[PDB]
Amino acid sequence: SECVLGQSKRVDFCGKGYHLMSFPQSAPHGVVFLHVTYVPAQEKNFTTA
Amino acid sequence: SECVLGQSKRVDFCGKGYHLMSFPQSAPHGVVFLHVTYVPAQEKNFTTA
Numbered sequence: 001s002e003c004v005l006g007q008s009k010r011v012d013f014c015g016k017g018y019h020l021m022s023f024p025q026s027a028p029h030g031v032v033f034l035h036v037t038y039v040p041a042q043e044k045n046f047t048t049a
Numbered sequence: 050s051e052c053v054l055g056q057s058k059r060v061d062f063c064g065k066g067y068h069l070m071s072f073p074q075s076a077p078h079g080v081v082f083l084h085v086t087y088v089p090a091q092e093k094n095f096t097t098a
């Protein structure tokens with residue numbers, strides 16, 4: 001309900017990183033979610049105020 | 050806590066649609082929530098960019 005039908009702000013609920021969308025996949029006696037997430041990379045130091 | 054005392058962004062948690070607010074009602078050995086919800090209607094196709 002929260003990952004597939006929507007976008008969840010809950011941290012590490014629908015996968016690590018910032019959630020974008022999820023895709024359900026069937027399995028024997030279960031369900032498999034492919035949690036697409038946005039992971040930042042290669043940060044840079046900056047002076048801030 | 051989440052539906053009555055506040056507004057829930059969780060999809061299909063506090064009712065089917067965009068949750069506005071909920072109202073609790075007591076019942077024997079349980080509780081009843083009246084989930085007020087905003088569901089859109091009257092769609093119209095439009096070209097987008």
Ligand SMILES: *[C@@H]1O[C@H](CO)[C@@H](O)[C@H](O)[C@H]1NC(C)=O
Binds near residue numbers: 043044045
């Ligand atoms: C920022 O600078 C500190 C010390 O100069 C260094 O240890 C750190 O790795 C730098 N971070 C990045 C992302 O370059």
Ligand SMILES: *[C@@H]1O[C@H](CO)[C@@H](O)[C@H](O)[C@H]1NC(C)=O
Binds near residue numbers: 091093
């Ligand atoms: C939009 O296009 C579809 C094409 O199948 C059509 O059925 C529908 O009536 C159109 N308008 C609405 C109400 O979204």
